[PDB]
């Protein structure tokens, strides 16, 4: 129960809700020794919050996503999106005047590319089990 509502505050980007979970439910976390992540999980949730918005919208403005994710300032938003591009999280282009962020739909992943290339690992996974069944059959 103390560890339950935690992930329920991870799905949301509210700071007041996330910090209240750490205060009340932090006692249960002491026995687990999981406190290492609580400092870096704040940076994890802000990536989930921006991924929720970036996947739901074509263009997302920095000023509109500012208070919606409550970054509260334009300057640190330029620092987050910069590191989001460094981590390959977001494809969004940014037009700096005030500024604002203007992105576009990413495509061309298509069909002929990803599924057949992933199927190389799928069949190589399956054909090995054919040997695993033969090896297990040889003992009896």
């Amino acid at each position: 129960m103390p560890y339950f509502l935690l992930t329920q505050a991870v799905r949301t980007g509210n700071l007041a809700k996330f910090n209240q979970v750490l205060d009340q439910f932090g006692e249960k976390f002491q026995a687990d020794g999981t406190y290492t992540l609580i400092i870096r999980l704040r940076h994890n949730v802000i990536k989930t919050g921006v991924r929720m918005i970036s996947l739901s919208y074509s263009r997302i403005s920095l000023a509109d996503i500012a208070q919606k994710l409550q970054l509260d300032s334009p300057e640190d938003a330029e620092f987050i999106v910069a590191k989001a591009i460094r981590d390959g999280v977001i494809e969004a282009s940014i037009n700096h005047e005030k500024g604002y962020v203007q992105s576009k739909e990413m495509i061309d992943i298509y069909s002929t590319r990803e599924p057949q290339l992933a199927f190389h690992q799928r069949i190589s996974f399956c054909l090995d089990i054919h040997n695993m069944s033969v090896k297990a059959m040889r003992f009896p």
Binding site: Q8, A9, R11, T12, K17
Partner: protein
């Protein structure tokens, strides 16, 4: 296991996975969406 370390230390439950998304987001909601009628 029971060996080694670990011994030392429809239903509504299934819908509760989605239902908790209603708790932290947009309530249910009737009243607010019912108040939006006369707003604009």
């Amino acid at each position: 296991m029971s060996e080694k370390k670990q011994p030392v230390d429809e239903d509504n439950w299934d819908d509760d996975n989605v239902e908790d998304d209603f708790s932290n987001q947009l309530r249910a909601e009737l009243e607010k969406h019912g108040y939006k009628m006369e707003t604009s």
